[PDB]
Symmetry: C3
């Protein structure tokens, strides 16, 4: 069971801890979705999402992309970005406790939080170009929504690595904390956000991200095809 759910008065906490790097494979995706279903059912005032003591998440399972069997790779991507969408439109404030590095799908998931807490040492990076991949459009829209114009350019085509103050200035995180306070502080911030008006928050949230959600729902729907363009375009 890679994911814990825990109610704590007006909030809930969701913690990812597979054995290793909180890889966002089908099994992890399901657990997280189930954990959010609990929060739905419990009608919580705010949600907190945390990784484990080594990472927030290393992102998608590398080998399910390597193995050549396309359909399950598409379902994983699709599922990863649906999950991102689900948190980015969530009607309650969502607070990300970034408890280690956050790479690729990990960073994209991070960027779907209302408020994102991390430590100086933790790397936040779209490493796609460094390992030979183009970034899919859905991740671009996620990043484009939080990153400054100049950080966005470097995070993408250069796979720039961002840490602490440079991540905050870039708009990958909203707040820095000491490692042993990250979760604690995410929880305190979640309780204060639960004090905001839920319906006004939910409505304003969606207005503040209207175009990006549209373009993300288009990136989800186009992920299979996007993968096919690549396949063909190499073949040429």
């Amino acid at each position: 069971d890679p994911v814990s759910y825990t109610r704590k008065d007006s909030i809930a906490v969701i913690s990812m801890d597979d054995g290793k790097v909180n890889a966002l494979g089908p099994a992890m995706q399901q657990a997280l979705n189930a954990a959010i279903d609990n929060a739905d059912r419990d009608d919580v005032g705010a949600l907190v999402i945390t990784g484990n003591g080594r990472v927030f998440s290393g992102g998608f399972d590398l080998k399910i992309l390597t193995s050549g069997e396309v359909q399950p790779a598409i379902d994983m991507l699709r599922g990863g970005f649906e999950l991102a969408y689900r948190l980015l439109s969530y009607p309650k404030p969502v607070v990300m406790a970034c408890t280690g590095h956050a790479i690729a799908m990990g960073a994209f998931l991070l960027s779907c939080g209302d408020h994102r807490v991390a430590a100086h040492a933790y790397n936040i990076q779209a490493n796609e170009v460094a390992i030979g991949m183009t970034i899919p459009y859905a991740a671009l829209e996620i990043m484009k929504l939080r990153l400054t114009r100049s950080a966005y350019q470097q995070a993408t085509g250069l796979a720039k690595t961002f840490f602490g103050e440079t991540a905050l200035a870039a708009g990958f995180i909203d707040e820095i904390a000491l490692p042993e306070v990250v979760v604690s502080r995410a929880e305190e911030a979640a309780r204060e956000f639960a004090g905001l008006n839920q319906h006004a928050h939910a409505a304003t949230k969606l207005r503040s991200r209207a175009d990006a959600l549209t373009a993300i729902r288009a990136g989800i729907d186009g992920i299979a095809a996007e993968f096919g363009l690549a396949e063909n375009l190499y073949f040429q």
Copy 2:
């Protein structure tokens, strides 16, 4: 008379000082419009707008929104955003001297300046979600035009409060000063901006804000309807 107009060589100064919080009610709106008409007539090289010693402005009159009588609430909103539009497209440089807090319509008005001067202590905040309101689209377009991508997310759905360096980094202000220098410094900056080429400035201004003015003129025109969607959508 809540508003003073004062010519000072190549510039003019407009100071808001009702008794209290520079509330942006019909009477305040009219005075300000009249004061800008003077500036039009006087053909000034630059305009400076200031609040009083307690605030820039607390925003719209709360009770004209509470009282249930819709038409005058719509006329006030409409008028507030027209005024914002008028300053955002003004052919002369406009310098905002933010002399205290600036909340909701106060912040939106502030964000229509070419250059915006404040002190570390002064709160700049769209408090709508904290008091139960969704932000209307015209204010969203104003903010979206000055705020960084990540500050914009928090200013809106979270009603984040911004002060001093965090306001400057967020793009709610352009310059920090000591409280007793704010006005003085706004005036000096206004005189230097009057030295820029007026027609090139006026043309470039409008090009730099083309889409946002279009979308703001749409938010003004849709404000009545926007209020009706809300009314109905609660009723469901």
Copy 3:
């Protein structure tokens, strides 16, 4: 010969040094295009572009704009922005070594780099409004792609001057260095970017700038007409 080309293992260096201010006239434009053709032919892993010890570039030749002979002024503008386009879509990482001030076309050219290195003392400025010109649309799209929302407003309608930390925060540069290290550091960064995956970098680059390239190709095509609107609109 205002431009040197030099291969250095996995990269190439292009240095502009006319006698003076690296003015971006027809002769300079041609040389630079030829120097990039070499890089094309040599299939380099990364490109570095530098000015001389006084400037990056003062921008377009002022007098070819003064002299009243329109056709060659249009060809120069057009050519300047084509060159910008060519670097902004280049399939290899492009590293700008900003070795002095960068004014108008100089700043716009600078803003077409993947990574932009400068010193604290060097001014980066769209001075158009200060000298009586409106900024053409192609330069606006270039700036709009790197500058924060609030820096963009001031860089344009106010011709704000940006230096060092304020340039970095504004998204005119990506990195500050001591003057005697700027080139050296640009070269080191170029070699590290050559280590990134070239095809993924090239593809991601274009995705990260899709709309802006479209709008820039429209600004190139409309530059003649844009100049005609101005001419007529004064005449009224």
